[PDB]
Amino acid sequence: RELIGEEQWNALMVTAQRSQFETDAKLNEQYRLKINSALNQEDPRTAWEMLQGIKAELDKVQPDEQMTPQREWLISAQ
Amino acid sequence: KIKEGVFRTREEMEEYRHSRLQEGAKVYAEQFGIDPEDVDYQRGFNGDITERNISLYGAHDNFLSQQAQKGAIMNSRV
Prior knowledge:
The structure is cut from a larger assembly and holds 2 copies of chain A. By secondary structure, chain A is mostly helical.
């Protein structure tokens, strides 16, 4: 983490997290459809547990706390 | 090997130079037929050893200086 600079390591981990969502479009499709079918539930309180579900299946593919664009989908969804 | 960066010190370049001098003075002779201890062979083989050594030492101390800079940076971060 210190050969490559701090800033460059941050960029690196951001890229390593968000690359597995534009290298395979199955992940992109699946997550975007779950997000959108979670914004269209009738009860707003039952959309929030769907959104915590999505935020729970993002922590299995992006394990570092940088601001990947998928963590922007979830923020706009909430 | 000097300007590629294999020897990190001066002692390793010194030992490598010395040993390869001996093994080459033998191998090239026995490839060309000439006696390795021949007096005329060792007149053009060992011809101008100090100028060769000075050129090598210079083109290695350039490397030592740049390596010291790199290491000093990567050490002032840790």
